Each structure stands twice: as structure tokens, then as C-alpha cells.
Amino acid sequence: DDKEFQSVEEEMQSTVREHRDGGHAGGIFNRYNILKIQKVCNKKLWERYTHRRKEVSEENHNHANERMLFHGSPFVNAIIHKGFDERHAIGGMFGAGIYFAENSSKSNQYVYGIGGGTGCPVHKDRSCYICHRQLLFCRVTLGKSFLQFSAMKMAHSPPGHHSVTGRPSVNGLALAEYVIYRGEQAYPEYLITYQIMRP
Ligand SMILES: O=C1N=CCc2c(O)cccc21
Ligand SMILES: [Zn+2]
């Protein structure tokens, strides 16, 4: 458990980047105080995930193209019990999808809502150093992933594809993002409780 969770902690800290908004959405910090890392064991969600992963693999030259990615949401507790649900997803960069990041600090910008919302419920602060936040570190099946640079408002995956990869560009994205259009293509494997730390 210790080495498995240290690997999660390393992924969480090492993928932090300096954000263009100067910390507006997610707060100002260089690292986190990781409080707890819990493995989510939801058999029904796991099987919904693996059934779809097998299907996608068969449609993508025997390859699921699975990645471990972060997800930030004010609804992590509904996600761990009921799973990711595309019915809760159009106005986003790549449309009506479920978004993930390979940089934990990008997902951190979504923990209190879009653009950070009004921050924590207690102090109404997007840069709250006191209130404990939660992120998910997820197993995500990308399958055949459609590489895109500019905004493309999809309702579903592009024809013949299983996801969209938003790649960084001068005029566009600062960091990558990964988008699925079917909730069963992600499993909320780790629940991370943490605080952002004052630099
Ligand atoms: O973790 C996320 N949660 C919601 C939206 C989002 C994005 O729109 C891009 C990358 C990551 C996330
Ligand atoms: Zn607070």
C-alpha cells in the first residue's frame, strides 16, 4: 500500500505547473500537503469500466490506450459511488465530455467549480490553504484518441474514435487535456485528500 500510494503522491506533486491565470482559479502554490490517499473499490463500477475497456481494446488493435489521469470536481463523492456520468456534461473546449488532466494542478482548478467557482464553501476562497480539497486519480480508457489543437464542440467522440486529446498550441492550450464522452471509460481509482501549500 505504502509504495503504491507514494507513487500516487509523486505523480500528484511532480505534475504541478505554473498556471497562466497566476493562480486565479486554483490558488497560488508550488506543492501540496497530501493528507490521505484512498483506493476506491467499487466492484460494479470496476466491471462497467473493464467491460468497456475490453470493447475499446478490440476496436483499437488489441490496445485500450489506458492512462492514469487526474479529475477535479465538486462532485467527487457522487463519482466514487455512481461513477462518471456523461449526462452531467457542450460549452466546454471539446464539448459535452468528461475532462481529465495529466497535470494535477490543472485538475485542481476544477475542484471548487469551473474557473474555481467561489472557492471553498467555508471561506469563499479559491486559494484556501486551510480547507481540505479532494482530487481523483483515475484509470481512463482513451482507445483511438482524436488529436485536436483548437476548440471543437463535440457531443460524442469523433467517428471511429474513443476520446479526444487536446494538445498544447501557441494560440490555444497551455497543457494537455483528455476527454471522454462515455462515463464508463473512466474509473475513479484513487481519492486524494490534500491542501494546496502557501509558497
Ligand atoms: O479535472 C478536470 N475537471 C473538469 C474539467 C477539466 C478540464 O476542462 C480540463 C482538464 C481537467 C479537468
Ligand atoms: Zn476555506
CSV table of C-alpha atoms and ligand atoms in Angstrom, one decimal:
chain,number,residue,atom,x,y,z
A,1,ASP,CA,0.0,0.0,0.0
A,2,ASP,CA,2.8,2.4,1.0
A,3,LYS,CA,4.8,2.2,-2.3
A,4,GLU,CA,1.6,2.3,-4.4
A,5,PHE,CA,0.4,5.4,-2.5
A,6,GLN,CA,4.0,7.0,-2.7
A,7,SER,CA,3.8,6.6,-6.5
A,8,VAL,CA,0.4,8.4,-6.4
A,9,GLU,CA,1.8,11.2,-4.2
A,10,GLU,CA,4.9,11.5,-6.6
A,11,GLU,CA,2.5,11.8,-9.6
A,12,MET,CA,0.4,14.4,-7.7
A,13,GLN,CA,3.5,16.6,-6.7
A,14,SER,CA,5.7,16.3,-9.8
A,15,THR,CA,3.0,17.2,-12.3
A,16,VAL,CA,2.3,20.7,-10.8
A,17,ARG,CA,2.9,23.5,-13.2
A,18,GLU,CA,2.7,27.4,-13.1
A,19,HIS,CA,-0.7,28.4,-14.4
A,20,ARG,CA,-1.2,31.3,-16.9
A,21,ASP,CA,-4.1,32.8,-14.8
A,22,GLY,CA,-1.5,33.3,-12.0
A,23,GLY,CA,-3.4,31.1,-9.6
A,24,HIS,CA,-6.8,32.8,-10.1
A,25,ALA,CA,-8.8,29.5,-10.5
A,26,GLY,CA,-6.9,27.0,-8.3
A,27,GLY,CA,-4.8,29.1,-5.9
A,28,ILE,CA,-1.2,30.0,-5.5
A,29,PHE,CA,1.1,27.1,-4.7
A,30,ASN,CA,4.1,25.1,-5.9
A,31,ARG,CA,3.3,21.8,-4.0
A,32,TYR,CA,0.6,20.2,-1.9
A,33,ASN,CA,0.2,18.8,1.6
A,34,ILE,CA,-1.1,15.3,0.8
A,35,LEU,CA,-3.3,14.2,3.7
A,36,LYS,CA,-4.8,10.9,2.6
A,37,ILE,CA,-4.8,8.6,-0.5
A,38,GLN,CA,-7.7,6.1,-0.6
A,39,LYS,CA,-8.2,3.3,-3.1
A,40,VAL,CA,-11.7,3.2,-4.3
A,41,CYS,CA,-13.0,-0.3,-4.5
A,42,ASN,CA,-16.4,-0.2,-6.2
A,43,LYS,CA,-16.9,-3.6,-7.9
A,44,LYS,CA,-19.9,-2.7,-10.1
A,45,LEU,CA,-18.1,0.5,-11.4
A,46,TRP,CA,-14.9,-1.5,-11.9
A,47,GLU,CA,-16.7,-4.1,-14.0
A,48,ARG,CA,-18.6,-1.4,-16.0
A,49,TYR,CA,-15.1,0.1,-16.7
A,50,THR,CA,-13.3,-3.2,-17.6
A,51,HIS,CA,-16.2,-4.3,-19.9
A,52,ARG,CA,-15.9,-1.1,-21.8
A,53,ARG,CA,-12.1,-1.3,-21.8
A,54,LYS,CA,-12.2,-4.8,-23.4
A,55,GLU,CA,-14.7,-3.4,-26.1
A,56,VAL,CA,-12.5,-0.4,-26.8
A,57,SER,CA,-9.3,-2.6,-27.0
A,58,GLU,CA,-11.0,-4.8,-29.6
A,59,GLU,CA,-11.8,-1.6,-31.6
A,60,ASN,CA,-8.2,-0.3,-31.3
A,61,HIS,CA,-5.8,-3.0,-32.5
A,62,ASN,CA,-5.9,-5.0,-29.1
A,63,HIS,CA,-5.0,-1.8,-27.2
A,64,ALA,CA,-7.1,0.1,-24.6
A,65,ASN,CA,-4.6,3.0,-24.6
A,66,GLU,CA,-5.3,3.4,-20.8
A,67,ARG,CA,-3.8,6.2,-18.9
A,68,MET,CA,-3.7,7.3,-15.2
A,69,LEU,CA,-5.1,10.9,-15.2
A,70,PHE,CA,-6.4,13.5,-12.7
A,71,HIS,CA,-10.0,14.7,-12.4
A,72,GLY,CA,-11.1,17.7,-10.3
A,73,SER,CA,-14.8,18.2,-9.4
A,74,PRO,CA,-17.0,19.5,-6.6
A,75,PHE,CA,-18.9,16.1,-7.1
A,76,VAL,CA,-16.1,13.5,-6.3
A,77,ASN,CA,-18.4,11.8,-3.7
A,78,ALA,CA,-21.2,11.2,-6.3
A,79,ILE,CA,-18.5,10.0,-8.8
A,80,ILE,CA,-17.0,7.4,-6.4
A,81,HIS,CA,-20.4,5.9,-5.7
A,82,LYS,CA,-22.2,6.2,-9.1
A,83,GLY,CA,-19.3,6.7,-11.5
A,84,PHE,CA,-18.6,9.2,-14.2
A,85,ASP,CA,-21.7,10.2,-16.0
A,86,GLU,CA,-21.7,11.9,-19.4
A,87,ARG,CA,-25.4,13.0,-18.7
A,88,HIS,CA,-23.8,15.7,-16.4
A,89,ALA,CA,-21.6,17.0,-19.4
A,90,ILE,CA,-21.5,21.2,-24.5
A,91,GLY,CA,-19.9,24.6,-23.6
A,92,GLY,CA,-16.5,23.1,-22.7
A,93,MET,CA,-13.5,23.4,-25.0
A,94,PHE,CA,-14.2,20.0,-26.6
A,95,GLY,CA,-17.9,19.9,-26.0
A,96,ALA,CA,-20.0,17.6,-23.8
A,97,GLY,CA,-17.3,15.4,-22.4
A,98,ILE,CA,-15.7,14.4,-19.2
A,99,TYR,CA,-12.3,16.0,-18.8
A,100,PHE,CA,-9.0,14.8,-17.3
A,101,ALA,CA,-5.5,16.2,-16.9
A,102,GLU,CA,-2.0,14.8,-16.8
A,103,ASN,CA,-1.1,17.8,-14.6
A,104,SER,CA,-2.6,17.6,-11.1
A,105,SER,CA,-2.6,21.4,-10.8
A,106,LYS,CA,-4.8,21.7,-13.9
A,107,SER,CA,-7.4,19.4,-12.3
A,108,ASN,CA,-7.1,21.4,-9.0
A,109,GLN,CA,-8.5,24.5,-10.9
A,110,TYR,CA,-11.9,22.5,-11.1
A,111,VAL,CA,-12.2,21.3,-7.6
A,112,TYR,CA,-14.5,24.2,-6.5
A,113,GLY,CA,-16.2,24.6,-9.9
A,114,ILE,CA,-15.5,26.0,-13.4
A,115,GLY,CA,-12.7,28.5,-13.1
A,116,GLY,CA,-12.5,27.6,-9.4
A,117,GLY,CA,-16.1,28.8,-8.7
A,118,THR,CA,-16.2,30.9,-5.5
A,119,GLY,CA,-13.5,28.6,-3.9
A,120,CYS,CA,-14.1,26.7,-0.6
A,121,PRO,CA,-17.6,26.7,0.9
A,122,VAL,CA,-16.3,28.0,4.3
A,123,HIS,CA,-14.1,31.0,3.4
A,124,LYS,CA,-15.2,31.5,-0.3
A,125,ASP,CA,-11.5,31.5,-1.2
A,126,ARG,CA,-10.1,29.9,-4.5
A,127,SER,CA,-6.6,30.0,-2.8
A,128,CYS,CA,-7.8,28.5,0.6
A,129,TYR,CA,-4.8,26.9,2.4
A,130,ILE,CA,-6.9,25.8,5.3
A,131,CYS,CA,-9.8,23.8,3.7
A,132,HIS,CA,-9.1,20.2,2.6
A,133,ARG,CA,-9.6,19.5,-1.1
A,134,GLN,CA,-10.2,16.3,-3.0
A,135,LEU,CA,-9.0,15.2,-6.5
A,136,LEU,CA,-9.4,11.8,-8.2
A,137,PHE,CA,-6.5,9.9,-9.9
A,138,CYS,CA,-8.3,7.8,-12.5
A,139,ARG,CA,-7.9,4.9,-14.9
A,140,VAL,CA,-9.0,6.4,-18.3
A,141,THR,CA,-9.5,4.3,-21.4
A,142,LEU,CA,-8.6,6.6,-24.4
A,143,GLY,CA,-8.6,4.0,-27.1
A,144,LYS,CA,-8.2,5.6,-30.5
A,145,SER,CA,-7.8,9.2,-29.4
A,146,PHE,CA,-8.6,12.1,-31.8
A,147,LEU,CA,-5.7,14.7,-31.6
A,148,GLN,CA,-7.1,18.3,-31.5
A,149,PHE,CA,-5.5,21.8,-31.0
A,150,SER,CA,-8.4,24.2,-31.3
A,151,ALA,CA,-11.9,24.2,-29.7
A,152,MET,CA,-14.2,21.6,-31.3
A,153,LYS,CA,-17.6,21.3,-29.5
A,154,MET,CA,-18.3,17.6,-29.8
A,155,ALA,CA,-21.5,15.9,-28.4
A,156,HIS,CA,-19.7,12.4,-28.8
A,157,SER,CA,-16.3,11.0,-29.8
A,158,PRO,CA,-15.4,11.7,-33.4
A,159,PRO,CA,-16.4,8.9,-35.8
A,160,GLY,CA,-14.1,5.9,-35.4
A,161,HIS,CA,-12.6,7.3,-32.2
A,162,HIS,CA,-13.0,6.7,-28.3
A,163,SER,CA,-11.8,10.0,-26.9
A,164,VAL,CA,-10.2,13.4,-27.8
A,165,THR,CA,-6.7,14.6,-26.8
A,166,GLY,CA,-6.4,18.3,-26.5
A,167,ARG,CA,-2.8,19.1,-27.4
A,168,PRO,CA,-1.0,22.4,-26.4
A,169,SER,CA,-0.7,25.2,-29.1
A,170,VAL,CA,0.6,28.9,-29.1
A,171,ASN,CA,-3.0,30.3,-29.7
A,172,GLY,CA,-4.6,27.6,-27.5
A,173,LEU,CA,-4.0,25.2,-24.7
A,174,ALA,CA,-1.1,25.6,-22.2
A,175,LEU,CA,-1.3,22.0,-21.1
A,176,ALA,CA,-2.8,18.7,-22.4
A,177,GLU,CA,-6.3,17.5,-21.6
A,178,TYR,CA,-8.1,14.2,-22.3
A,179,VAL,CA,-11.8,14.0,-23.0
A,180,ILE,CA,-14.1,11.0,-22.9
A,181,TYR,CA,-17.8,11.1,-24.0
A,182,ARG,CA,-18.9,7.9,-22.2
A,183,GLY,CA,-18.8,7.7,-18.4
A,184,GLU,CA,-17.9,4.0,-18.3
A,185,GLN,CA,-14.5,4.9,-20.0
A,186,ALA,CA,-13.1,6.0,-16.6
A,187,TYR,CA,-12.7,4.5,-13.1
A,188,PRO,CA,-12.1,6.8,-10.1
A,189,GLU,CA,-9.2,4.6,-8.7
A,190,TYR,CA,-7.7,6.9,-6.1
A,191,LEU,CA,-9.3,9.6,-3.9
A,192,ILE,CA,-6.7,12.1,-2.8
A,193,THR,CA,-7.4,14.5,0.1
A,194,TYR,CA,-4.9,17.4,0.2
A,195,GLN,CA,-4.3,21.1,0.7
A,196,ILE,CA,-2.5,23.5,-1.5
A,197,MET,CA,0.5,24.9,0.3
A,198,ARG,CA,1.5,28.6,0.6
A,199,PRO,CA,4.7,29.1,-1.4
B,1,LIG,O1,-10.1,17.7,-14.0
B,1,LIG,C1,-11.0,18.4,-14.7
B,1,LIG,N1,-12.2,18.6,-14.2
B,1,LIG,C2,-13.1,19.3,-15.0
B,1,LIG,C3,-12.7,20.0,-16.2
B,1,LIG,C4,-11.4,19.8,-16.7
B,1,LIG,C5,-10.9,20.5,-17.9
B,1,LIG,O2,-11.9,21.2,-18.6
B,1,LIG,C6,-9.7,20.2,-18.5
B,1,LIG,C7,-8.7,19.3,-17.7
B,1,LIG,C8,-9.1,18.8,-16.5
B,1,LIG,C9,-10.4,19.0,-16.0
B,2,ZN,ZN,-11.5,27.5,3.2
